[PDB]
Symmetry: D2
Subunit: 344 residues, 4 copies
Amino acid sequence: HQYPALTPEQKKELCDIAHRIVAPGKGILAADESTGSIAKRLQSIGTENTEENRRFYRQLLLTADDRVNPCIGGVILFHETLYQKADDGRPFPQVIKAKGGVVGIKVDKGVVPLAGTNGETTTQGLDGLSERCAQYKKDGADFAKWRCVLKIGEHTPSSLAIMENANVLARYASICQQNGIVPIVEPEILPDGDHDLKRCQYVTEKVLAAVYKALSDHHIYLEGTLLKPNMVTPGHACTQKYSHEEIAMATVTALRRTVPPAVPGITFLSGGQSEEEASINLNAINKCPLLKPWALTFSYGRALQASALKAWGGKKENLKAAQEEYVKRALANSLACQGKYTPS
Amino acid sequence: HQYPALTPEQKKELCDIAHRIVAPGKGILAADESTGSIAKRLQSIGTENTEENRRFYRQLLLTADDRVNPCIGGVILFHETLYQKADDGRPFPQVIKAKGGVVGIKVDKGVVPLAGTNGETTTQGLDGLSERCAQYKKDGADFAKWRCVLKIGEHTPSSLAIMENANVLARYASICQQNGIVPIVEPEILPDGDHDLKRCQYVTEKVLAAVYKALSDHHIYLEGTLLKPNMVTPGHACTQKYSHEEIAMATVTALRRTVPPAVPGITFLSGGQSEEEASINLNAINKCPLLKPWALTFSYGRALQASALKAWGGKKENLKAAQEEYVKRALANSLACQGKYTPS
Amino acid sequence: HQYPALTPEQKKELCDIAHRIVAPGKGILAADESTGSIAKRLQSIGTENTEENRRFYRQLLLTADDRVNPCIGGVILFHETLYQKADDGRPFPQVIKAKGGVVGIKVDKGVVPLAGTNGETTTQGLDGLSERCAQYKKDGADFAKWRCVLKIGEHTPSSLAIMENANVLARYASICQQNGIVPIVEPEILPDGDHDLKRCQYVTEKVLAAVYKALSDHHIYLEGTLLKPNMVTPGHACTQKYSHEEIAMATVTALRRTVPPAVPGITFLSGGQSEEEASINLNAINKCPLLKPWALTFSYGRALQASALKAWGGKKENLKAAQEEYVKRALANSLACQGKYTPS
Amino acid sequence: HQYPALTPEQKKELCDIAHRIVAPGKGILAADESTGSIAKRLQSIGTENTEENRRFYRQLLLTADDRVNPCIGGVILFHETLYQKADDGRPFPQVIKAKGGVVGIKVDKGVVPLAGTNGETTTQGLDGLSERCAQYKKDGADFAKWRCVLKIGEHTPSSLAIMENANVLARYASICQQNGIVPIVEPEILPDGDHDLKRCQYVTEKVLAAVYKALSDHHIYLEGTLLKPNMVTPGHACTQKYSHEEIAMATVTALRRTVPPAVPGITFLSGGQSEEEASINLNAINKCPLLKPWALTFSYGRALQASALKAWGGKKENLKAAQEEYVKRALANSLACQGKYTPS
């Protein structure tokens, strides 16, 4: 480093956090559903949108039993959710730390259109981000989430969208690492479209290559980062059927062609997939015959808890049973990231 | 345009605004002194920093006589200053429009360090900028100012700083043009250092080339933009003495090597220069024997009003006389941007 | 310049050559038809392809009367054609210098496919180019031609092709300027396709912006260069009919949005256009109401001499008459680059 | 792949060649000493420079015993050396194939200065490279070598030099893979200078990141490539002493931060190092506690054969003994790339 951006102590801290997140059998739980998204989910389960509703939803998910201690290496919370307290009164980050995980917080402020593109958007949130990261690390958070959205179309992702999303991801990563927070670079490719699996693999390769070029450009310490990419899955309109083995082969091939080995782990996202589909795909990815020099685990916000949310149904009396459903995913996903999961 | 970013009506509006700003004999007045900067200036003149102080300072500058009608093509205001009212009670943008100018507003939220660079910084402010631009155009503002800071050092400006400042400038320009506001791209090179004039010219050429590459990348309509670059002036520690003719030659050479002709005008900045130094340099630049296909006018926040601020001295009774000093610059600067100014 | 690439004497020489090429009423004659192209032309006129055939073809074109002294500011020759001698025995560059022009030589060695693109190609020729440029300047040549080919398709020009052609153009320009030769940057967009005029303008803007970014990157002295772009003309399959005024508006708009004013002149290419079509389009471009800070002249290899080639018909006795046809274009084109041409 | 550059059969062939080159215990022998370099070496050993001299030098090295069958996975030859024949009369590629290796050929035509840089140079050789690669694959060659030179100075490597060398490396790689030849990307950093090990690591990280960005840009199939980087070794004038463990840590750290796992192997270069120094450094690199997902072997043109060249001394009678010295390195280097080498 000509002008170092991190002291060796800071690099040690970021490496420790990142490796404790993606330790074998551990994955990320995503409770980052903002007001609109959690309102949509609560409408789906027939519940009104209030702060107490999110509070008992987190009580359902965050305050689970001790069986999910190794499964959940970390959770990502929302701002109010990070500041909210449990029924017992203890703060939620304290609950997560007692459970054994690490607290994370969604940082991005949403997507804003790019002028002159076919619906391509970039993500904002960089204003005053250093102060927010300092405050969130004061509040027990040790990693952050920033979601950038790129879509596969006939003429998209354009060069402008790819480089702009990569640059804002790198800026967010630098600001996070300057404040002791491990960034999660999340270039997320939408599964919408008629594109087949080969097209998705090609676009994922290009996007990840530009992402890590931008990370190298901004002097990002790669061992203090995580990756949250979409699995290489064909579009909903694609008539060709691809087995889980083919999904795993394409995904691991893209990650081996792009992601440097200094990345501690790759935490995949749901991307509209079902819980069983995501579990089987993660198990196949962890069972790929290729050489995989980074941890391949999960960061799911829908797969782990769709069954639990349906079981709760806006009712308190189902709580334990609903919590059971959540465990029924977490343990299973702990087997998915270890390549030890057997469906049915 | 594969996917057009502006309708022809919007392009016409931006072209009209930009050309009315830099019409012959017209320049930009910069009243963008934020709380810290205006507090420093008021401490220099021995005045406390309150909202009423800024209010009567703008009353001194904005509510001048009718002799400055052609000289001042537009002014840039601060958020409170744009929302503030005069002693008569009329809003300041109404005063500016009655005077004949066009209202502008400083948009950037300040500079934030870049990790891993020798003090290089980027500028933030993109969060929710479209809504702010819509509100400001509802408030009579038609152009905006975003100041990016690049400095000439032994190993700076780095590639990272240059491309990051160019990219954020292009993003700000696209957001502004999407809301009917003409952006002023302001890559400002600090005069600090021991570098000579050749080094400053080289760095200015590289920075402007990257700036307009980024503007082309983000589909910026160049005719709806303005440029606010520093004149090619050597550092304070540079022992070599450069005549105003050499300053003009280097500046116009850099602008001809970099700036496309679609740019309606180039409004220079003070950059720590004195009022007479800036006036003479602008007059020499407008008298350069080369072919200059864009308007070369001024955007001064110190040169036009340093004498007026000193004359005011925190006292109301000097008002008219202080206003006279302001006029003593504006008329002169109207001669500087027409190449018709004679010192002494 | 941190490490200068040209001494002031070299910059003066390049500026002098470039400005003498594009002096008002002067344009470039292109005799760069390689073995395949000149063989195709001679087959079209029913003549076999030998060295003597090219020799008397150049005798037809190069050894014209004194009426074409101001019209032809320079010619571009082939390697053998540069080394060939006239019927009188004087070398062809001596003939050109006596006529009043400046000798140029085609430098590029042809196009080679880019792997992984939809037929996109880059241009080779950089190997040992400095020695060849030194030899050619020893042989009276003062400028050079390098043709890069980009095509407008559904998904082309790709980012790879655009940046690669721009980079090889900049490398060729740097090598030429290091040896006293004024490069002609020729990013040529094929008119093939169903794309309309707006698409061609957009692609031309992007290509020219990347070209001049690459020229700035390689420290090219812009005043020692020329530009040979295609006019913004719709595809052959485009059903919409665009007037010459619209062609001129789109072309000058692209050039004003992209080309810096330091470029001494822009010498357009035929691009499959007819002689009268090219003459009328150049006349309209020179009559555009916009501000055009660079010379807008011609570099034609087909328009100036198609009539002369047809008149010759592989026969010596038509020589003078065929030469007359050539003059019938050159004078007319001298009126086209001055905006003084009247059809019929 | 939107427009595939290689059929699956071609990818299989390139993967097979690349993995057979860097199979465990195998490395590259470099006999690429051009006329000037081999003349300098022969002057050092007191021998005149003729074709027969190179012929018996290759007879010394290429026609060794059967003990070097697993050690030497491949050799890189010169054009004449590839076309030369042994004393028995069998062609040298046949000798290499019988020994068990794979034939390679140096492709680059040398370094040419970059205008406007502090001595930075780029490499030429792309002209007609596809035909040469086709001919060389017809002559038994299956991989190629292209050496690009970047140097660490006070202000170098510049951005221009880094991106230009990366782009020409990617172009060479694409041309090679289009003709069944596995390219060796060789961005070689000169050890000249007073820079310490941290500076060399930083520059190596940036150069490798740009190199693989350019490889991704040109659609290079990474599994059909090899890498030939310099070990992260401080300058000759650097007063600080770095242990072999520190060299290994810095080198593997740079490779893990930059090189994707799809690269079959990384074959280091001598870089002016001694034979024992290179062997110990390679052994330490193969013994690094980090996760190394690519083969880490050698590509030495001086370390393997300096002792053999000194033992030969321009005399035939020492042949066997000199060959013994060559074996004394090869076996040792087979232990260096397996992490099984013990000095003394």
